[PDB]
Amino acid sequence: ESVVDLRGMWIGLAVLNVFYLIVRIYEQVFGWRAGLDSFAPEFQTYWMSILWTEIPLELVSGLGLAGYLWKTRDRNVDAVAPREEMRRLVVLVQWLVVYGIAIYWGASFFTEQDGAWHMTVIRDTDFTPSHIIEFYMSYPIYSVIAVGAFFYAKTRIPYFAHGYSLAFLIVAIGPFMIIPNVGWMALGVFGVVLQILGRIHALIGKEGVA
């Protein structure tokens, strides 16, 4: 046993960061001479190919991940040894770090990216390269990852099982309320980490050591 692992995190991080780097390189190259005119055939082969593809892929990945975490749920969750609970919630904190990064890419990088593109084209379509990546990829990805963190907590930690953490609810559902044109935000990660800390605090009575 080791209560701290972290392999899963680095995998999720490397896989996620190199993917978006590929996406950024891909749009630097095919943004010009593919993405400027949405009536051209190139737009179909380089941009709409992504769109038509990613939506079902994200939808299956989302239902597939939840369904899996539920089938593999701990049916004997109230019985969890203090140590294994400590591990499971270090794993939750892993999920939340990946989600941290996903949110950065989705809500900072690609969202403000759309800003510059609006000053580049006059828009043939709702589906600009910017939008294909931002609204139809970047956002659903972290939406998925958020639903996974929630489902992991609901299925592994007694506390997040029987209940629904109001804060964690806001975290999983809030994304499905992002809409632009044409303060109630997600930041409930605050409550979620306090619940975790609430729990780490309780998993030691002899805490003069800190």
């Binding site: 899963g8 995998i11 896989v15 993917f19 190919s49 992504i50 593809t53 892929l57 899996y68």
Partner: peptide, 19 residues
């Protein structure tokens, strides 16, 4: 071209085969 379902199908699968 089809780094649509490429790097994305491959990012989803290197994950699922690490369970």
């Amino acid at each position: 071209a089809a780094a649509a379902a490429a790097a994305a199908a491959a990012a989803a699968a290197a994950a699922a085969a690490a369970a």
